[PDB]
Write an enzyme that holds these catalytic residues in place. Structure first.
Site, short mmCIF file in Angstrom:
data_model
loop_
_atom_site.label_atom_id
_atom_site.label_comp_id
_atom_site.label_asym_id
_atom_site.label_seq_id
_atom_site.Cartn_x
_atom_site.Cartn_y
_atom_site.Cartn_z
N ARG A 87 -17.33 98.53 45.98
CA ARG A 87 -17.72 99.15 44.81
C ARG A 87 -17.03 99.43 43.24
O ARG A 87 -17.53 99.64 42.65
CB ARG A 87 -16.40 100.37 44.88
N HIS A 138 -17.45 95.80 42.06
CA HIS A 138 -17.51 95.36 41.12
C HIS A 138 -19.56 95.23 41.65
O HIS A 138 -20.10 94.39 41.18
CB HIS A 138 -17.37 93.62 41.37
N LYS A 189 -9.62 102.03 33.37
CA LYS A 189 -9.40 101.04 33.68
C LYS A 189 -10.41 100.07 32.21
O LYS A 189 -10.92 100.24 32.49
CB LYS A 189 -10.55 99.96 35.25
N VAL A 195 -11.32 96.83 32.15
CA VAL A 195 -12.39 96.05 31.98
C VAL A 195 -12.50 95.28 32.90
O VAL A 195 -12.02 95.32 34.11
CB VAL A 195 -11.74 94.32 31.29
N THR A 251 -16.34 93.72 35.71
CA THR A 251 -18.32 93.89 35.58
C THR A 251 -18.81 93.92 37.14
O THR A 251 -17.88 94.40 37.89
CB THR A 251 -17.94 92.54 35.71
N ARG A 280 -16.11 97.00 28.97
CA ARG A 280 -15.26 97.33 28.19
C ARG A 280 -14.90 98.24 27.33
O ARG A 280 -15.40 99.22 26.80
CB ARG A 280 -14.90 96.20 27.11
N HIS A 310 -11.79 89.90 44.98
CA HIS A 310 -11.79 89.72 43.41
C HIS A 310 -12.90 89.04 43.05
O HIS A 310 -12.82 88.01 43.09
CB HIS A 310 -10.10 89.99 43.22
N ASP A 313 -13.55 87.41 39.21
CA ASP A 313 -11.85 86.94 38.44
C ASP A 313 -12.25 86.78 37.32
O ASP A 313 -11.87 86.97 36.18
CB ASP A 313 -11.72 85.81 39.34
N1 LIG Z 1 -11.99 88.63 34.29
C1 LIG Z 1 -12.70 90.25 34.42
C2 LIG Z 1 -11.90 90.44 35.16
N2 LIG Z 1 -12.12 91.41 35.76
C3 LIG Z 1 -14.00 91.68 35.53
O1 LIG Z 1 -14.26 92.93 36.63
N3 LIG Z 1 -14.36 90.84 35.00
C4 LIG Z 1 -14.35 90.03 34.16
O2 LIG Z 1 -14.92 89.62 33.74
#
Ligand SMILES: Nc1c[nH]c(=O)[nH]c1=O
Length: 124
Positions: A10, A12, A41, A43, A45, A85, A119, A121
């Site tokens: 969900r 990522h 949130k 940040v 990806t 971001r 996760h 990272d």
């Molecule tokens: N460092 C990170 C943590 N969590 C994310 O979704 N993207 C990133 O770049």
């Protein structure tokens, strides 16, 4: 009760598009994936590869996690991703994001049986 693996998907996974559709990609996705529910949130990806390809990373290059655990893995190939971001101007509940597409190696933490990403990272 959502599993860690489902949560990773969900938060990522977005195989539906090949790369940050548009400038408002993050604005829509952060909301639709329920990442703006209780806060903005800051940040996040999204990965634009197959679930199979991303799951496969768990058997790829073993590297240290940022928190010091040893169950992180870096992709041997670059993958299409989008970073979201939060903008300086963003104010909950109107979470605003900068959408950035790139091609980078991903690093995920994996757990469980089956051994799968739980996760995100880093990207590198
Ligand atoms: N460092 C990170 C943590 N969590 C994310 O979704 N993207 C990133 O770049």
């Amino acid at each position: 009760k959502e599993t860690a693996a489902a949560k990773f998907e969900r938060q990522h996974m977005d195989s539906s598009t090949s790369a940050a559709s548009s400038s408002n990609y993050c604005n829509q996705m952060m909301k639709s994936r329920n990442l703006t529910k209780d806060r903005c949130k800051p940040v996040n990806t999204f990965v634009h590869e197959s679930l199979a390809d991303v799951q496969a990373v768990c058997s790829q290059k073993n590297v240290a996690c940022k928190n010091g655990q040893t169950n992180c893995y870096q992709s041997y190939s670059t993958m299409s991703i989008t970073d979201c971001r939060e903008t300086g101007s963003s104010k909950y509940p109107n979470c605003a994001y900068k959408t950035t597409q790139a091609n980078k190696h991903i690093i995920v933490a994996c757990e469980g049986n089956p051994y799968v990403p739980v996760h995100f990272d880093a990207s590198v």
